[PDB]
Structure 1
C-alpha cells in the first residue's frame, strides 16, 4: 500500500469538492462547513450502528486518513540526501547525534505536568520504526540533558519530546445547597449499591431524624447492621443528631439498600462539612461507588467461578 504524492494530492482535490457537495446537501454554508459538521452530516446520511467506530463510514481529510509516509531519500543521481542514510535509522541516529553534540558543548561551557513522549509517538515524529531499547537509549540522553544546566535553547529542544499529562483531581464535587419553601438549607445526592438506587436529602439543621421511604429508619431497617451503616457517615464527622435526612431507596435487598443510602447521605453531607473533612471522608471509603456487582453465570459451569465436578477417568 504505497500511496504516491500525486495520488494523495488528487485525494485532497476530491475532499474539497466533496466537502462543498456535502454542505449543499445539508443546506449549510460551503465556506463555514467544519470537520465536526461533516461528521454530523455523515452520521445522519449513513447511519451505522457498528460498535467499533473505526469501521463506521468516515469522510476525513486525506492527510488524516492515509498514513504518514517518508519521502524519497535519494535523487536521480543516486546520492542519498542524508549523511546518515546507510545507518538505516537516519532520523533516529540524526537525533542521537544532535543530543550528544549539545551535551559536549554544554560541558565545555561549564514531572506531573508533562510525561516523556511514549515510544509509538516518537516513532511518528521520526517516521522510523524503533526498538524498545532504542527508545530507552534516547530517553536516557534526554534525561541526562535535563540533569545538566541546559540553556534556553536546549530546554526548548527537550520540550519537543515532552507531552502534557493532565492530572485528574481526586477531589469530591460538592452539591449546591438549596433552600425549600420554608428556607431550610438542604442538599440532595444519589447513591447506587448493586441494584439499589437511593436519593438522599440531607438538611443542614436537624435533630437526627432519618426517614426512609417515609418510614422511620429503625422501623425500615430492623437489622442492626443496616442501622450501623447509616450511622457511619455521620459518626465519622461527629455530626450525629445535627441533621435531618429524607431519603428514598428502591431495588436491591436489605444490605444493598442500606449501602446505597450510606453513599447518598455521605455525598449530600459534604455540603455541610469542611473541605478537609470531605477529604477524610473520601479516604475512609464513604464517597466511592462500590463497583462489586454480581458476576454472570457462564455456560458449561455451575456458577460464575465454580466448575462442574471434574472426572480424571
Structure 2
C-alpha cells in the first residue's frame, strides 16, 4: 500500500514514495513540473519508471532537501528505481544496465591550499 525509496545526488537528498496513481507527482508540496518551472533536465529523473513502463501507473509523494535542484532531481531519479526493486526485485535488470539504480560519488574537490581553487593555480611570471 506504499513504495518508498531514497536517492541522493551531491549535497542533495530525496525521499521518494511511489503510489499507484494516475501519474501525478507531489514533490515537497506543489506539482512536479511546478517545482521544476523551466529545467530541461527535469523529465530525466522520471526516466527509471519509464525504463520499466511504469510512468503513468503510479503517483509518488516526494521530498527533497540538500544543495540545489540539479542535485535534487538526480537524487529523485535515484530513489525511484531504488523503489521499483522493492516492487520488483527482478527490476534490477532494465535499470542497472541503464545505470539509474546507481548513485555516483562524483563530488566536490576541497579548495586546496596554495591553489586558488581545488585545482586552479595562481599564474606567475617565470622570468
Match of 2:42 among 195, 213, 227: 227
After superposition, residues 265-280 of structure 1 pair within 5 angstroms as: 265-273=80-88, 275=90, 277-280=91-94
Give the Cα–Cα distance (whole angstroms) in 1 for the partners of residues 52 and 74 of structure 2.
18
Is 2:4 the partner of 1:188?
yes
Is 2:40 the partner of 1:262?
no
Shift of 1:258: 0.4
Q: Deviations over 1:170-209 (max 9, x none)?
A: xxxxxxxxxxxxxxx2121111111111101112x21111
Give the Cα–Cα distance (whole angstroms) in 1 for the partners of residues 21 and 112 of structure 2.
49
Shift of 1:254: 1.4
Give the Cα–Cα distance (whole angstroms) in 2 for the partners of residues 249 and 193 of structure 1.
11
After superposition, residues 119-268 of structure 1 pair within 5 angstroms as: 185-203=1-19, 205-268=20-83
Residue 139 of structure 1 is matched in structure 2 by none
Match of 2:109 among 288, 295, 308: 295
Residue 121 of structure 1 is matched in structure 2 by none
**When you count strand as a share of all residues, which structure comes out higher?**
2
Runs (5+) with no aligned partner, structure 1? 1-184
Contact 1:233–1:266 (8 Å) recurs in 2: yes
Give the Cα–Cα distance (whole angstroms) in 2 for the partners of residues 288 and 250 of structure 1.
19
- Computed over aligned residues only, the root mean square deviation of the Cα atoms, in angstroms, reads 1.4
Q: Deviations over 1:18-60 (max 9, x none)?
A: xxxxxxxxxxxxxxxxxxxxxxxxxxxxxxxxxxxxxxxxxxx
Contact 2:45–2:78 (8 Å) recurs in 1: no
**Structure with bigger gyration radius:** 1
TM-score by length of 1: 0.39
Give the Cα–Cα distance (whole angstroms) in 1 for the partners of residues 29 and 115 of structure 2.
43
Give the Cα–Cα distance (whole angstroms) in 2 for the partners of residues 231 and 200 of structure 1.
11
Residue 118 of structure 2 is matched in structure 1 by 304
The aligned length equals: 127
Residue 12 of structure 1 is matched in structure 2 by none
TM-score by length of 2: 0.91
